[PDB]
Amino acid sequence: MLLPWLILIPFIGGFLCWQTERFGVKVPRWIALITMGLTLALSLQLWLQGGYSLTQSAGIPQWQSEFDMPWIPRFGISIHLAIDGLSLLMVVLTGLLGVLAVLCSWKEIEKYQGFFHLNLMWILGGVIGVFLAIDMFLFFFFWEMMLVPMYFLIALWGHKASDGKTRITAATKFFIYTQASGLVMLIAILALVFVHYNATGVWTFNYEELLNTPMSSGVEYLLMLGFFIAFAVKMPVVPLHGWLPDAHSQAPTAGSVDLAGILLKTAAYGLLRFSLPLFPNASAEFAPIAMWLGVIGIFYGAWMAFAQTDIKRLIAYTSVSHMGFVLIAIYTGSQLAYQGAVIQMIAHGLSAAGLFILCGQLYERIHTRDMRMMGGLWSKMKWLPALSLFFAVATLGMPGTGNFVGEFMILFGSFQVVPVITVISTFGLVFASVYSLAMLHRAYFGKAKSQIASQELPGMSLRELFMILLLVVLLVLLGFYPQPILDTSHSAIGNIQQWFVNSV
């Protein structure tokens, strides 16, 4: 009953951000902050009232909250939202990253800031809708709906240093990748709906009805392949990853579009929620290919991140490697590795948010993202290189940060299932330490390699310092006390794992 408002408050807030722009040019940021704080507070209230710690695994479906409303009754399509532990964690993460995105673009006093804030809130509402929708058509609708404001933000509000054509090209590549993969997923959804309609005789796009769908081996594999192609584009899984570094490099320079658009892992959630329960046998036969795609993603992303001369491109390829770890975790059928995947999703969101916000502030300071021009910046800045050192320390899987908890619980469960893939992935963790040290030494240590880095740079403001230190505190608390997060998602992960291993 609060889930429709969880989606609607961002949309109404974006509309009010556009409308209240005429009242003043400093008004839309306040409106976006109020509605993002309201969405975060509603998700936190759902967390407090859900009682997820004392929830046992009763089998799929098991929702802590559920809303249903008829939308297109001809096809049996409904606005069907449902929240449980995993979805709740993703929604709270989306709200926190949305508040961070609003605070990140606070100093934008441009003439059309209301449209920027409307696009931001529409992206955030679409992401929350992806995390909440259990009607398959509604899930696909939110999935493809959140890409239009993403496209326009990248194309029109993006990186000022690049020319217009490069931003248009990056936005077009991102849109083509995501929407073509989404259309393949829509083909799979439609074919599953028609298989169920031939088996029973009724139209349904409901997740719970489509779970009990008898399919032949081979049809189920093809539906699984369509779902996985969509999720692999948005994860990213190699080779469907090329859109991501150009989308990050041409995103708006503050970083809010990286936080709102990319750093929320809807594809790993979709693999856990849909690909594994709807097609458990096909996922069981796809597990070796998906595991080796994850291994290649880890190592390819590490090598790409090391070879970047752009710091934002480096952070994008770090995201590719970490999602390779999560992809290995998802296809393993182990509760421990699934819980590690949840922790890794949250921790990667927090650490990549910190890295991208710090990179945006650094670009504001020195007006270049090329690491061949910045050097020895530890002596020039007051706070930024130390916090960047902390976040690069987190991204290599440092104990005391949640990244270590996620990565190592993934590796423990995966070794219990697949040992060879696990040992190769731990050597991938060595590769992660390599690229993090390389970024740190090329940026902030050594001697100045140009003239802009040779002079004193202004200190970080109280708002930037506050949001970065909040991310630091959250990552440290996740590293040292991950038990509330593990208890929140324990029942949902248990249901998904039991469904996956009881049907194979």
- Rounded Cα–Cα distance for residues 360 and 381 (Å): 14
- Binding track over 298-317 against another protein, x by CB under 8 A: --x--xx-xxx---------
Strand positions, DSSP E, 73-144: 77-83
CB 27 within 8 A of CB 21: yes
Tokens of 374: 């910045």
Residue 56 CB-density burial (10 A; 0-12 exposed, 13-18 middle, 19+ buried): exposed
Task: State yes or no: residue 392 binds ligand 3PE (CB under 6 A).
Answer: no
- Binding track over 239-278 against ligand 3PE, x by CB under 6 A: -x--------------------------------------
Nearer to ligand 3PE, 81 or 192 (CB): 192
φ/ψ of residue 206, rounded to 5: -75, 140
Q: Which helix (H) or strand (E) holds 175?
A: helix 164-199
Task: State yes or no: residue 429 binds another protein (CB under 8 A).
Answer: yes
For residue 322, the number of C-alpha atoms closer than 13 Å in the C-beta half-sphere is 34
Sign of CA dihedral 342, 175, 183, 11: positive
335-366 helix and 384-395 helix, angle to the nearest 10 degrees:
150
Partner from ligand 3PE, another protein, none contacting 412, C-beta within 5 to 8 A by type: another protein
Q: How far is the CB of 477 from ligand 3PE (least distance, A)?
A: 5
Task: State yes or no: residue 223 binds ligand 3PE (CB under 6 A).
Answer: yes
- Binding track over 196-225 against another protein, x by CB under 8 A: ------------------------------
Nearer to another protein, 16 or 358 (CB): 358
Could you identify the residue written with the tokens 């979709």?
270
- Binding track over 446-485 against ligand 3PE, x by CB under 6 A: --------------------------xx--xx--xx----
Task: State yes or no: residue 503 binds another protein (CB under 8 A).
Answer: no
Give the one residue of 422, 488, 491, 495 binding another protein; rule: CB under 8 A.
422
- Residue 454 DSSP label: G
Task: State yes or no: residue 166 binds another protein (CB under 8 A).
Answer: no
Please enumerate, as own/partner, the contacts of 151-158 that have beta carbons within 8 Å and a separation of 24 or more. Answer: 151/175, 152/119, 153/116, 153/119, 153/120, 153/123, 153/251, 153/252, 153/257, 153/261, 154/247, 154/250, 154/251, 154/252, 154/257, 157/116, 157/119, 157/252, 157/257, 158/250, 158/251, 158/252, 158/253, 158/257
Task: State yes or no: residue 307 binds ligand 3PE (CB under 6 A).
Answer: no
Residues near ligand 3PE (CB under 6 A): 169, 172-173, 176-177, 180-181, 184, 187-188, 191, 195, 198, 215-219, 221-223, 225-226, 229, 233, 240, 299, 382-383, 385-387, 389-390, 393, 398-400, 419-420, 423-424, 427, 430, 434, 438, 441-442, 472-473, 476-477, 480-481
Residues near another protein (CB under 8 A): 238-242, 245, 300, 303-304, 306-308, 335-336, 339, 376, 378-379, 382-383, 386, 393, 398-400, 404-405, 408-409, 411-412, 415-416, 419, 422-423, 426-427, 429-430, 433-434, 437-438, 441, 444-447, 480-483, 486, 490
